[PDB]
Design a protein around this ligand. Structure first.
Ligand code: NAG
Ligand code: NAG
Lengths: 50, 49
């Protein structure tokens, strides 16, 4: 680390940029939250229709 | 232009029309909420919120 600190910082910044870009591409990354909300919403919706 | 009756998903009327006149009406159950008694124990006090 103490000999390659600048390289490690560059790679870390690049990785953060890449993950930000991936998050700014599609919502399918958050496929779990969009299910924990969509299942409860669907349950309430099908309870209304009863 | 047909019947004075309307319906929704929950099968409870929402929009109707008057018999005597021809004005459209929107039906909506009035202010409904839910009470939530915020209280300490009985022995410490009786005042609630
Ligand atoms: C019924 O009431 C409506 C609205 O006031 C009126 O236009 C209509 O002429 C009435 N019908 C009668 C009095 O037969
Ligand atoms: C009721 O009395 C007990 C003492 O026996 C006390 O410790 C407790 O705090 C009292 N209840 C409340 C809600 O404070």
């Amino acid at each position: 680390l103490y000999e390659n600190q600048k390289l490690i910082a560059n790679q870390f910044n690049s990785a953060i940029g890449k993950i930000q870009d991936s998050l700014s591409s599609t919502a399918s990354a958050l496929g779990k939250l969009q299910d924990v909300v969509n299942q409860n919403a669907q349950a309430l919706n099908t309870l209304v229709k009863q | 232009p047909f019947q004075q009756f309307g319906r929704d998903i929950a099968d409870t009327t929402d929009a109707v029309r008057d018999p005597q006149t021809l004005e459209i009406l929107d039906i909506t159950p009035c202010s409904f909420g839910g009470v939530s008694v915020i209280t300490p124990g009985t022995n410490t006090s009786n005042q609630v919120a």
